Amino acid sequence: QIFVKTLTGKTITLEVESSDTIDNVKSKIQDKEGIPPDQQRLIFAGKQ
Amino acid sequence: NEVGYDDIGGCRKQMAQIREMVELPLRHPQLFKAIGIKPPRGVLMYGPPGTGKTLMARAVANETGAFFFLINGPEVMSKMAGESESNLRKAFEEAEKNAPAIIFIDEIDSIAPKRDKTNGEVERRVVSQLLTLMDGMKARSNVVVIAATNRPNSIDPALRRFGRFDREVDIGIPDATGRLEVLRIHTKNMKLADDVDLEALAAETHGYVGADIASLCSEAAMQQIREKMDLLDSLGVTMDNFRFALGNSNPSALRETVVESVNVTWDDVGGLDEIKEELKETVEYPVLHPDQYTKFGLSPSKGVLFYGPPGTGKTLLAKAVATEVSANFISVKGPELLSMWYGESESNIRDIFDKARAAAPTVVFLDQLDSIAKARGGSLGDAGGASDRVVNQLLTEMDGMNAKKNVFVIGATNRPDQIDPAILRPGRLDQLIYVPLPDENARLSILNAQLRKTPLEPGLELTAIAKATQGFSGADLLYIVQRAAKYAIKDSI
Amino acid sequence: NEVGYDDIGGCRKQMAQIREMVELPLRHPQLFKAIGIKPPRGVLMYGPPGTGKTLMARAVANETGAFFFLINGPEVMSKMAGESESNLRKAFEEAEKNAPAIIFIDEIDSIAPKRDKTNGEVERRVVSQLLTLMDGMKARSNVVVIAATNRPNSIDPALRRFGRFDREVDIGIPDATGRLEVLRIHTKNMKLADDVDLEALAAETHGYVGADIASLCSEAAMQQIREKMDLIDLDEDEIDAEVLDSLGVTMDNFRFALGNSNPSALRETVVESVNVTWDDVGGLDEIKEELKETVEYPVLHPDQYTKFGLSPSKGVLFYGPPGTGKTLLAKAVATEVSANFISVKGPELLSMWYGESESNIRDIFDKARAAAPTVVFLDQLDSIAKARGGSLGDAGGASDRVVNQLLTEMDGMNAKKNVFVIGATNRPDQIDPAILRPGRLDQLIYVPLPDENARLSILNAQLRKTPLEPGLELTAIAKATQGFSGADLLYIVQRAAKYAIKDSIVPYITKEHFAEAMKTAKRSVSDAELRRYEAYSQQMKASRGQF
Numbered sequence A: 001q002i003f004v005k006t007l008t009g010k011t012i013t014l015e016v017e018s019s020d021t022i023d024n025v026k027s028k029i030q031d032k033e034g035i036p037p038d039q040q041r042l043i044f045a046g047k048q
Numbered sequence B: 001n002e003v004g005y006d007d008i009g010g011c012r013k014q015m016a017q018i019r020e021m022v023e024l025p026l027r028h029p030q031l032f033k034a035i036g037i038k039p040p041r042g043v044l045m046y047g048p049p050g051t052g053k054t055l056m057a058r059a060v061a062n063e064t065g066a067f068f069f070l071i072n073g074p075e076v077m078s079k080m081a082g083e084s085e086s087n088l089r090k091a092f093e094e095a096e097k098n099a100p101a102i103i104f105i106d107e108i109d110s111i112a113p114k115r116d117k118t119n120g121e122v123e124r125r126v127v128s129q130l131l132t133l134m135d136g137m138k139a140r141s142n143v144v145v146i147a148a149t150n151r152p153n154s155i156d157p158a159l160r161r162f163g164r165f166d167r168e169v170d171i172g173i174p175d176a177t178g179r180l181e182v183l184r185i186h187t188k189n190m191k192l193a194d195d196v197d198l199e200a201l202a203a204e205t206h207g208y209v210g211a212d213i214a215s216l217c218s219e220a221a222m223q224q225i226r227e228k229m230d231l232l233d234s235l236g237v238t239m240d241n242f243r244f245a246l247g248n249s250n251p252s253a254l255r256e257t258v259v260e261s262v263n264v265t266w267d268d269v270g271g272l273d274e275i276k277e278e279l280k281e282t283v284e285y286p287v288l289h290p291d292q293y294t295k296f297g298l299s300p301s302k303g304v305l306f307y308g309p310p311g312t313g314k315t316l317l318a319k320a321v322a323t324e325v326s327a328n329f330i331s332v333k334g335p336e337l338l339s340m341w342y343g344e345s346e347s348n349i350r351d352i353f354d355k356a357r358a359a360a361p362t363v364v365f366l367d368q369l370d371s372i373a374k375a376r377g378g379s380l381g382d383a384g385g386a387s388d389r390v391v392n393q394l395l396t397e398m399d400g401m402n403a404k405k406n407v408f409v410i411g412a413t414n415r416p417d418q419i420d421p422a423i424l425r426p427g428r429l430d431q432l433i434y435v436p437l438p439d440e441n442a443r444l445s446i447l448n449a450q451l452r453k454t455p456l457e458p459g460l461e462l463t464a465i466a467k468a469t470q471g472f473s474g475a476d477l478l479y480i481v482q483r484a485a486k487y488a489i490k491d492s493i
Numbered sequence C: 001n002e003v004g005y006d007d008i009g010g011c012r013k014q015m016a017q018i019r020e021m022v023e024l025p026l027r028h029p030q031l032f033k034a035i036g037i038k039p040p041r042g043v044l045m046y047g048p049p050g051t052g053k054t055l056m057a058r059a060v061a062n063e064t065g066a067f068f069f070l071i072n073g074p075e076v077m078s079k080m081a082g083e084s085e086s087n088l089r090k091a092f093e094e095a096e097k098n099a100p101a102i103i104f105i106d107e108i109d110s111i112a113p114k115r116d117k118t119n120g121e122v123e124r125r126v127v128s129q130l131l132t133l134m135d136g137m138k139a140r141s142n143v144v145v146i147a148a149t150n151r152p153n154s155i156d157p158a159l160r161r162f163g164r165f166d167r168e169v170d171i172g173i174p175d176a177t178g179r180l181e182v183l184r185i186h187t188k189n190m191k192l193a194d195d196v197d198l199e200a201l202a203a204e205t206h207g208y209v210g211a212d213i214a215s216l217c218s219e220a221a222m223q224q225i226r227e228k229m230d231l232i233d234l235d236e237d238e239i240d241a242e243v244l245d246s247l248g249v250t251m252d253n254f255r256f257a258l259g260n261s262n263p264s265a266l267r268e269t270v271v272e273s274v275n276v277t278w279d280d281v282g283g284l285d286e287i288k289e290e291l292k293e294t295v296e297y298p299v300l301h302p303d304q305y306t307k308f309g310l311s312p313s314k315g316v317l318f319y320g321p322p323g324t325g326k327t328l329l330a331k332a333v334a335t336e337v338s339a340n341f342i343s344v345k346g347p348e349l350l351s352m353w354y355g356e357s358e359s360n361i362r363d364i365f366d367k368a369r370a371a372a373p374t375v376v377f378l379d380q381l382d383s384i385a386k387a388r389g390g391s392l393g394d395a396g397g398a399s400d401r402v403v404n405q406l407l408t409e410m411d412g413m414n415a416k417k418n419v420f421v422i423g424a425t426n427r428p429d430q431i432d433p434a435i436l437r438p439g440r441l442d443q444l445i446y447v448p449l450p451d452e453n454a455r456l457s458i459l460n461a462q463l464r465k466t467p468l469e470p471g472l473e474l475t476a477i478a479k480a481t482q483g484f485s486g487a488d489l490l491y492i493v494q495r496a497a498k499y500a501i502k503d504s505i506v507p508y509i510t511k512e513h514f515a516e517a518m519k520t521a522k523r524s525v526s527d528a529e530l531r532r533y534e535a536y537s538q539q540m541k542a543s544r545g546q547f
């Protein structure tokens, strides 16, 4: 004719937010992004 | 802009303990290599808040010549991507490059909790970085680490090792001469009048701390400028401003551990002409003659169980015994029970048991015995492990405590058979003193005791009221005298 | 600075066990080829803190001349999960090419705690990386890994398997000759005085570890500084450098250092023995030679006692009149066989929080195997019946939390592990029949009324802790009580000694303190309870079953 009562407790979280390895950024630089319409980029030649 | 060196009073005993500890080996690399003993590289300061933890560390490090690397508790660990360890590694590396140095870690309890209250993963990463880097100072780099905390039980127990933190310095509450000394160094720049008496203020303020004494002088000056304001000529703080500050304010006992010494003198409980000789051998004779137990070899009985009739028995039969000591009384009571369902059941008592021998003299009163160990210690017990953690620390802290320092416990209840019989184990409760019912020769002096501050006409007979009281205890004597004061003010109405 | 054999002390018998266990795979691998079985790779040291287990690992590495590498505990957890596994892999690769080598790791409890109480993510990260690297390596490079902790069952139980960590080594506290050797190493540079005795300080600190002795002499040397504080102050920056040669730490500074210090590693009971003889209690000689026939005969002749098919006499009991010397005999039962012994009691050790109520009996089972021999003893068996429970009717049992771990492993251990349970109750009518069975308590040792005519010899060995009067009065002090044993005889002593605090600001002990003490001559143990069990002492053979 009796009872059992017990509560609980929690811990939410911690974070660091660590990212961006160096090998991904070196591949991130050597690319293209697009050029409007007529914004050619050119070639050039010389030094015969 | 910093504080001096002699701006701390009352803590002179702990000052001389710490002046030889952290100041003398810092300025003197000799007399330790010649003696062949390496100096300690860690100290720990703890005690009640508002006692001078953060003040004494800045005072002892300024006027000695040092580097004084300051580091705060909650300011670390608030970083991102795990750079609190690099802020700790650069802290100890830059200190030893320009030795002598002092690394004062303030609020270390907010950095290192116990391993059962761990939170996340960055809390484990900074307590193991501190334990590794503390061991790296064995090269005698003249670096002293000072750590200040508030709760020594909530800290991680792996910090007190041989080399990390060997010495601990406890800062207690000041006495009547100690609280008077802080009042001299707090009214230095204040314009005072002549009606003030600092000896009477220190004698009235018993349960005051090193921070409450700063509130007594600053509130009386704020009260005085609220009077003097009309169309800065004379602002001497008067006695009535300090008397008003005693009334509207309060000491640090905001339902915390109680700091008071409310005791009554003799002939305040009626009779006792054959019972007063039975109580003088338990709180006076271990204090007046301690050598009688050390010469023989007996353990002094620091505990006396009290039980009696209704009316009296709880406080006025126990607080009238310790008139000669008048120390701080830290008591457990009704609301001090299992309020938190996890941990804070006997951990609120662990700082009562361990501090009774560290902050001696300290008298601990125990009451409400039918609300702590009634069903748990019986034959039926507790089945499930829900709240069976109450009858264990009350018994295992008995054999672990010896009579090295001045400890004293008093158990009082209305039902002596409702408590567990292991509380009445031999060796701890060998002296059983029973307070009886006051007879006819004692009930007449009860009516002369609780009628103390009254304009009582001595022409009447108080014996004739007490002669009609046979089964009426001191509560019914209080009941028959409260109605005599109800119609007395009604005569003035 | 490097350490050798002389820089440690106290554990010289314990060090020799670790000596032959690690020097045979390092120096002479030809025994592996001859006997054809794999030598161990992982040892584990444990014990109380401050016993110099890290100093012993540096001593065994430099003297053998192997490639020593140290991996500390909290320095691994100070990093994240990524770089800690890379640092653990680099340590094992350099020791393989430098064979023979010793990879000593420290503080395995911080890396490997008990995992089932906190089912987490990082609790199986660094230990699973270690387990596939420890069991996974195989190159016959005969390298030894040494572990160190403070508790053997605090670590994860999967590490204590075959091939990974098999040999457990306990590091106990040093003896009186052992603690003397610790201070002699630390006082090589301490300029002590001539009055300081070497052997006197060993008997002073009974349960101090080597870390406590090293902090004791430094505090006593610091008191020598504060004693000479008024001679030369600190304002002069070492100007008077000619009086510092007269700095001798004389022996009462060590007496002051003992007065302020406290034992740190004595939060438990004794780990070695207790020493109180059967002559310290008066009489009871009719059971002295009787107990010599049941507990010291099989341990001296293990072949003739077991080749006849007789079971080992593992359990005895003490019963009779309640509280009549059996509580006094709680400590005087270990010195006969002089083995290891730890007393257990209901409100003492098994009434703690949940999870630790069975780990205390686990330590006496590690003492049956790793620290053999052992002696188990439980007193006041009628108070434990409230926790065990009483069987009612014809269908009952003792549904208790602690009796399941007790009764199963107390019969599985053989006679070579030297298990010895001792019982002592106050009334045999308050014994639970579910615990009693034929095979556990078949040895009857009846304790009679403790010799009230000869009880003057009991109190003669009780008043030897205080200088007393030479003209004693021992005419009828204990012969008129007949129910007051040596436990309750202290109350008569407390009657004749509580008056020292009174009549003070002189005689201390008079003859009237014992002559007038016979006014409270009462009897708590009446003769009505003794005569029920005096006939039971000759008829318990017909009632040695259920009740």
Ligand SMILES: Nc1ncnc2c1ncn2[C@@H]1O[C@H](COP(=O)(O)OP(=O)(O)OP(=O)(O)O)[C@@H](O)[C@H]1O
Pocket: B007, B008, B009, B010, B011, B048, B049, B050, B051, B052, B053, B054, B055, B056, B107, B148, B182, B209, B210, B211, B214
């Ligand atoms: N001798 C003294 N003891 C205690 N307090 C003092 C003393 N002298 C001055 N004080 C007052 O107390 C304050 C210093 O208290 P402190 O900063 O040490 O608080 P604490 O609770 O002791 O430690 P923490 O700052 O970590 O809480 C000062 O502002 C000062 O006015």
Ligand SMILES: Nc1ncnc2c1ncn2[C@@H]1O[C@H](COP(=O)(O)OP(=O)(O)OP(=O)(O)O)[C@@H](O)[C@H]1O
Pocket: B268, B269, B270, B271, B309, B310, B311, B312, B313, B314, B315, B316, B367, B412, B413, B414, B438, B446, B449, B450, B473, B474, B475, B478
């Ligand atoms: N010498 C005395 N004898 C009897 N009663 C007294 C005496 N002096 C004061 N009293 C009155 O009797 C009361 C004392 O009662 P008390 O507080 O002891 O209650 P109690 O029920 O006895 O305590 P507990 O709750 O521990 O049983 C006080 O309120 C006081 O006014």
Ligand SMILES: Nc1ncnc2c1ncn2[C@@H]1O[C@H](COP(=O)(O)OP(=O)(O)OP(=O)(O)O)[C@@H](O)[C@H]1O
Pocket: B162, C007, C008, C009, C010, C011, C049, C050, C051, C052, C053, C054, C055, C056, C106, C107, C148, C149, C182, C185, C209, C210, C211, C214
């Ligand atoms: N032979 C010895 N036996 C025991 N103690 C010694 C011995 N030689 C020196 N000591 C002292 O004991 C201490 C050794 O303790 P140690 O540094 O090993 O702590 P520990 O807790 O065992 O290490 P860990 O943190 O790895 O567990 C030293 O400070 C030293 O003064």
